[PDB]
Write a protein that binds this ligand. Structure first.
Ligand SMILES: CNc1nc(Nc2ccc(N3CCCC3=O)cc2OC)nc2[nH]cc(C#N)c12
Length: 260
């Protein structure tokens, strides 16, 4: 099996992930180098799908001029029938590496943190709010964390979703803020520090949504050595969006700034 994209030929090692219409494969180029290719079959596709897929290709194009922490889009073929995106290839997604129930070198966790902030800050700077960041949204390449889905299109799953990372304003605002990504980054850090996400314990997802949106519900923050990390997690995970810490604040925080 093979894939010709904008004149170049790539051979399919392994499918890595799937989506609605999409498939992402790990492939080699004519020079036995690693890439990822995302395939989207557009034959069946509303114009909103079409429009969403179009948008983020463009945003991905611009956005990678501004940050190493966004995965690169080398090339793309697009026609009325399919999309091919030749992209830099991750090693695995944060959500799989996390579930290799490991424990994290405290200075890799700090560097991964730095990485998510850089990347989310970048999309924020060009007007994007993911409002659904999860570990699946991050790839590990060269001991960096790089972002892949800007939450715009029909997002993929690496080869059932999740709601521990839902910002309370997301639950409340059903009957957007950049601060709602701080929350989900919050849960991913919390997860990364305490081996579990905040309300990961309320296993019935009605009672879990309430907890998230519930004032006299208390997230537990077990004391730990890096008390700066404890403060970050504590200000990320405030229920009041206006009381929650901004991304530009987080970037001026002792946790990322002082080399402990
Ligand atoms: C998920 N989509 C992507 N995935 C990867 N890498 C990768 C991700 C996951 C895994 N898994 C998953 C469980 C077992 C295992 O190995 C393996 C992987 O590499 C072989 N690189 C990418 N670049 C652009 C992408 C898009 N869109 C993209």
């Amino acid at each position: 099996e093979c894939i010709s994209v904008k004149g170049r030929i790539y051979s399919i090692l392994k499918q890595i992930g799937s989506g609605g219409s999409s498939k992402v494969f790990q492939v080699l180029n004519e020079k036995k180098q690693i890439y990822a290719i995302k395939y989207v079959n557009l034959e069946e596709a509303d114009n909103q799908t079409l429009d969403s897929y179009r948008n983020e290709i463009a945003y991905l194009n611009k956005l990678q001029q501004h940050s190493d922490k966004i995965i690169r889009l080398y090339d793309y073929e697009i026609t009325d029938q399919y999309i091919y995106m030749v992209m830099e290839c991750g090693n695995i997604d944060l959500n799989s590496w996390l579930k290799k129930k490991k424990s994290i070198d405290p200075w890799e966790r700090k560097s991964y943190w730095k990485n998510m902030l850089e990347a989310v800050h970048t999309i924020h700077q060009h007007g994007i709010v993911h409002s659904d960041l999860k570990p699946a949204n991050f790839l590990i390449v060269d001991g960096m964390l790089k972002l892949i889905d800007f939450g715009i299109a029909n997002q993929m799953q690496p080869d059932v979703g999740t709601v521990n990372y839902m910002p309370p304003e997301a639950i409340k605002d059903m009957s957007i803020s950049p601060k709602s990504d701080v929350w989900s980054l919050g849960c991913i850090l919390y997860y990364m520090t305490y081996g579990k996400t905040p309300f990961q314990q309320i296993i019935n997802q009605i009672s879990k949504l309430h907890a998230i949106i519930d004032p006299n519900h208390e997230i537990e923050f077990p004391d730990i050595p890096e008390k700066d990390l404890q403060d970050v997690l504590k200000c990320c995970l405030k229920r009041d969006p206006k009381q929650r810490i901004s991304i530009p604040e987080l970037l001026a925080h002792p946790y990322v700034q002082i080399q402990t």
